[PDB]
Amino acid sequence: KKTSFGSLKDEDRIFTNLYGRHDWRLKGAQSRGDWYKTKEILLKGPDWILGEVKTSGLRGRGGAGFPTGLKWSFMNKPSDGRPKYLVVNADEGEPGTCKDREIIRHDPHKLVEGCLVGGRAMGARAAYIYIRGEFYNEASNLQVAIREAYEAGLIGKNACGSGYDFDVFVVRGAGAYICGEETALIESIEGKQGKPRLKPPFPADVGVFGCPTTVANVETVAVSPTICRRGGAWFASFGRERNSGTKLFNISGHVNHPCTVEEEMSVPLKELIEKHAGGVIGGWDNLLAVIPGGSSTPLIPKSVCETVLMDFDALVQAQTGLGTAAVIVMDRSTDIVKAIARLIEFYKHESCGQCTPCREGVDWMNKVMARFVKGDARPAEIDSLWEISKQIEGHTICALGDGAAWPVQGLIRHFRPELEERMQQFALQHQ
Amino acid sequence: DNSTYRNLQHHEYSTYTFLDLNVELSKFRMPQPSSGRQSPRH
Amino acid sequence: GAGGALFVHRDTPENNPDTPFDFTPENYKRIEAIVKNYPEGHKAAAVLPVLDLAQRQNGWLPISAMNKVAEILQVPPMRVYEVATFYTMYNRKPVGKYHIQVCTTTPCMLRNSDSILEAIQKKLGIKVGETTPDKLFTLIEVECLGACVNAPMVQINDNYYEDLTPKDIEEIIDELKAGKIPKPGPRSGRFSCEPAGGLTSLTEPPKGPGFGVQAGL
Amino acid sequence: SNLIEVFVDGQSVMVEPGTTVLQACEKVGMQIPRFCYHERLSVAGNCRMCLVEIEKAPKVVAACAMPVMKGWNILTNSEKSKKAREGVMEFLLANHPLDCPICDQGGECDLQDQSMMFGSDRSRFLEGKRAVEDKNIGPLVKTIMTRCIQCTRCIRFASEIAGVDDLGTTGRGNDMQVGTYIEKMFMSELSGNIIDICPVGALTSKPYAFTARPWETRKTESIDVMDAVG
Amino acid sequence: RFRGEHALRRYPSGEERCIACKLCEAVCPAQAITIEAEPRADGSRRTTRYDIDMTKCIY
Amino acid sequence: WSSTADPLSNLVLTFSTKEDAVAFAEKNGWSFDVEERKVPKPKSKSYGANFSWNKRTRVSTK
Numbered sequence A: 001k002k003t004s005f006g007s008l009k010d011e012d013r014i015f016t017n018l019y020g021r022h023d024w025r026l027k028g029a030q031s032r033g034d035w036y037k038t039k040e041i042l043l044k045g046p047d048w049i050l051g052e053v054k055t056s057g058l059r060g061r062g063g064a065g066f067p068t069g070l071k072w073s074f075m076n077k078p079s080d081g082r083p084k085y086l087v088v089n090a091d092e093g094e095p096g097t098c099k100d101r102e103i104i105r106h107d108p109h110k111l112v113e114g115c116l117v118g119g120r121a122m123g124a125r126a127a128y129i130y131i132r133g134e135f136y137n138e139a140s141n142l143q144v145a146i147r148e149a150y151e152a153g154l155i156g157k158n159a160c161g162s163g164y165d166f167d168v169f170v171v172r173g174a175g176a177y178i179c180g181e182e183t184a185l186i187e188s189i190e191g192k193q194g195k196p197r198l199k200p201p202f203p204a205d206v207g208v209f210g211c212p213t214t215v216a217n218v219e220t221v222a223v224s225p226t227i228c229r230r231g232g233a234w235f236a237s238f239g240r241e242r243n244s245g246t247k248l249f250n251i252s253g254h255v256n257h258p259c260t261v262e263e264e265m266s267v268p269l270k271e272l273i274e275k276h277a278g279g280v281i282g283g284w285d286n287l288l289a290v291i292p293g294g295s296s297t298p299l300i301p302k303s304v305c306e307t308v309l310m311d312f313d314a315l316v317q318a319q320t321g322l323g324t325a326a327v328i329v330m331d332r333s334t335d336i337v338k339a340i341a342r343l344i345e346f347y348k349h350e351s352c353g354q355c356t357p358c359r360e361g362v363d364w365m366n367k368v369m370a371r372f373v374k375g376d377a378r379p380a381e382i383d384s385l386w387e388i389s390k391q392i393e394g395h396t397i398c399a400l401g402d403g404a405a406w407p408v409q410g411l412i413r414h415f416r417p418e419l420e421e422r423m424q425q426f427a428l429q430h431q
Numbered sequence B: 001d002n003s004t005y006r007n008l009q010h011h012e013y014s015t016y017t018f019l020d021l022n023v024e025l026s027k028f029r030m031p032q033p034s035s036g037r038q039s040p041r042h
Numbered sequence C: 001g002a003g004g005a006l007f008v009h010r011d012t013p014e015n016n017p018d019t020p021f022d023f024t025p026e027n028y029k030r031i032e033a034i035v036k037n038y039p040e041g042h043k044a045a046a047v048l049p050v051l052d053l054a055q056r057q058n059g060w061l062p063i064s065a066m067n068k069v070a071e072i073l074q075v076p077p078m079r080v081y082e083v084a085t086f087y088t089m090y091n092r093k094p095v096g097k098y099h100i101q102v103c104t105t106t107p108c109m110l111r112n113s114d115s116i117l118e119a120i121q122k123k124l125g126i127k128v129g130e131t132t133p134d135k136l137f138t139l140i141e142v143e144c145l146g147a148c149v150n151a152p153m154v155q156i157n158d159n160y161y162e163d164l165t166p167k168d169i170e171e172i173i174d175e176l177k178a179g180k181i182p183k184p185g186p187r188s189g190r191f192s193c194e195p196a197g198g199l200t201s202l203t204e205p206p207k208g209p210g211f212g213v214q215a216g217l
Numbered sequence D: 001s002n003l004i005e006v007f008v009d010g011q012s013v014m015v016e017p018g019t020t021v022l023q024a025c026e027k028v029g030m031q032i033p034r035f036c037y038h039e040r041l042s043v044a045g046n047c048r049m050c051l052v053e054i055e056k057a058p059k060v061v062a063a064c065a066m067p068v069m070k071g072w073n074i075l076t077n078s079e080k081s082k083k084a085r086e087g088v089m090e091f092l093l094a095n096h097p098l099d100c101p102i103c104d105q106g107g108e109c110d111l112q113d114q115s116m117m118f119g120s121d122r123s124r125f126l127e128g129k130r131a132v133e134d135k136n137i138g139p140l141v142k143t144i145m146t147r148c149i150q151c152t153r154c155i156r157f158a159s160e161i162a163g164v165d166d167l168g169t170t171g172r173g174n175d176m177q178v179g180t181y182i183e184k185m186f187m188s189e190l191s192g193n194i195i196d197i198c199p200v201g202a203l204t205s206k207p208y209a210f211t212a213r214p215w216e217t218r219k220t221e222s223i224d225v226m227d228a229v230g
Numbered sequence E: 001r002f003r004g005e006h007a008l009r010r011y012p013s014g015e016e017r018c019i020a021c022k023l024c025e026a027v028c029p030a031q032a033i034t035i036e037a038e039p040r041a042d043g044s045r046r047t048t049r050y051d052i053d054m055t056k057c058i059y
Numbered sequence F: 001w002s003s004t005a006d007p008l009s010n011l012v013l014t015f016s017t018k019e020d021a022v023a024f025a026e027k028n029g030w031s032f033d034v035e036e037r038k039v040p041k042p043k044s045k046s047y048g049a050n051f052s053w054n055k056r057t058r059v060s061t062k
Ligand SMILES: NC(=O)C1=CN([C@@H]2O[C@H](COP(=O)(O)OP(=O)(O)OC[C@H]3O[C@@H](n4cnc5c(N)ncnc54)[C@H](O)[C@@H]3O)[C@@H](O)[C@H]2O)C=CC1
Pocket: A060, A061, A062, A063, A064, A065, A066, A071, A074, A091, A092, A093, A094, A097, A180, A182, A202, A203, A215, A294, A296, A297, A323, A324, A398, A399
């Protein structure tokens, strides 16, 4: 019914300690409404919690956008003999993305309570939080909050006046972007290299230690208990249909005030930038391009950025995708080819090397891109490069290959004249 | 109220803080499940 | 682009299987807690933390440390070698006292992250991949560190230094040289990634317990 | 009984539950291209050479690892599967060394034959190739690792069949290399078999080096007498 | 382009070009080439026998 | 060179079935030995067994 989105009231945000201006420990969290009626939520049953998540319309906050109630119900099968586990994906490897770091270091008890609520919903015996290895102080804050939760009886033995036993473990990575991929994360937890495994089987059947497992993003887990407390309908009231809720947004690059903010789902990109990030450096006319959802998503130019909304469906219709909602803006005083080439070099340095298309083709893309920045190539190759990206996407084990193919495709599609002009200028300069 | 930043506790975290917290928490855990064997190589 | 670090080990007077490495008793206590974290029958899952612990005790990972971890956890040594060579936070070569990592990925590069790189080079008189003669600093370039909003930034020994200018990085370096530790976080007094002068959210006092609870709960 | 019905290029076949697309195609007489899959090894799914199209499914599946489902129609000779094969062979050949005249696997190479049968006939790779240093694993298996295609057949054989955990992968991405990471001889009573399972000239027989070509040889089927196994 | 008496060539360093791939032996329509090879004392891939029967050769 | 004196050293014949080869050999007066065809037995392959909760099929690397 509502048509205009983007005015989120202060009392309506989920992460009310996003900026760390309040006590991140247990006392402040209870003061702000955390660990309230948690026993009632646990005693209401797993089916009720799953239904609340389903009518909430919550989609996966890792970036894929899969309906979360559907996965958590996939886990809802009867017992087999193996223990059941919840895995929280706190790897946060995507360039431009820092939201999980802020919700982990400043509001850890929301994450812990979400772990408990989700584990109760899916019948898990424990939760493993795979925190990025570089987030050492954030991991220590998480461990201190978990210590407080154990001391207060909120988790562990009986966890409440509930009768449900639940442990929360924190495990640290060691410098691997690929270990954010859920199967690669499970492999890393088991002590092997961070190489993704093929699907099927899905983690709900065979996961960590060979047991049923659900991997969920930090934001999804951390918002689940508030959804249970306030209701699925309250969460579903925000955003368009199939795009419900409030999403954390990271604004970085050529803005006056780069920042992380929580805002309604279907906000316009221009509105978000001009309201929370202070505008693009040099005014809106100075905008050249935006990567709206992290490095994996293709970039879009100013013409489409003018009137585009920030959600999965609208950004898919703009041929990009919402991704992780990491807006990276670039004005007309930057080298767009150089920026895309740097992203491709990042992907070359982050591939695990397991499958030949990603390994070989991403290395090849990196080499071609470096030449492109110089302009050392010829016009005929651009099409060649486009074909190479197509070969990679849809043929690899995991989606890192797609995430390396898409930025190249976006750059070609929206800035072929710039590549052609650079090649022509190089040819003129070198004779 | 909001003017003060209240996450300075990580300013005195040492090289062993995480592992020491893990050791402290080791007494609060539930007994682990077992696969039945000492190792997959057993 | 090209890495520059080899992934084969050749024996060496200061790096060989007889290089003396052992865990301290309290590190053995930490190891036993770490192993207790995982289900019985799956002890290889402790390879990543325990190996990390060895580095925290030693500063880097000799081949003897890898063998010691493999024999403590009763896993084949080749598995520990694969783990050590896969993850980039493990130092298979000795490193300086202050490992300086500069993020140069696109969001950080947009906000002038090479100026801070060259400032560090000029201050230390070393190139990107080397170590100072006194074995006190080691420059290196890394990918996105998860603080893109506070760009440009560096990481030194578990600490994040954010919102940097070349003057700020010079003061951080000479404060490290003095002997004391500079405080982590962003510079310019921005306090963990809010708008610099905007303050466009979370201004009203947060609501208390049970503010918007539904009926029947 | 419990058999399910699937289709290979429209032809019906009944298979046991859990049967892979590759095995269903085998039951019809079609051999799917492969590099990393082996019948007696565990499934890997690395080389992506077995990618095949399922009717009315937008994404290709890895035939060696994906169990077939009831009603599926596998399109082995479809345009999408042919293009997938061509792309995977292009990626495999991008960094491969031009070693065929000096490679001992010249006339009996699965890489060569599958390139002629399923790949393109030309290259559009205009860069320099990677080169890795050779490892020494004993006087029986000669190692030239620039020819390696990272199928991990040798690692799986050594771990599962031979019961020796000496082989692994070190590194990441493009410079991930198969080896031991230390100077170590791979010695076992079954060590020479990794020469046969290696699809390329990366692992060869050292005493056999440069003596013959596979098309010259005459084959006599006989019995070993070095023990009582026969 | 004239085809006359056969010859074996070498690099400017004096090292012989033949590396015993046996492609010429495989392609010879008259089966006039006989080749035997082994590793050299320096590990090089070289021939120990390279015979051409000129009364079988069709040039 | 390698010299031979038997004219049938390079003679190899192709047949659709074993019965055809037996008929040809019998009508041509040659004593024969027939070996039955060896066929690879069907194998049970499961990618999920690579990551096993409690079996020995769990792999240490992939
Ligand atoms: N948060 C971060 O730092 C990063 C996020 N990403 C984002 O991750 C996205 C791609 O991730 P993927 O997991 O590969 O996408 P995906 O669609 O394959 O998986 C989505 C989730 O839903 C589950 N799922 C999907 N289909 C299922 C089915 N048929 N049955 C059972 N479960 C099913 C999956 O197990 C998975 O957990 C990308 O769009 C990217 O933007 C990428 C890099 C970093």
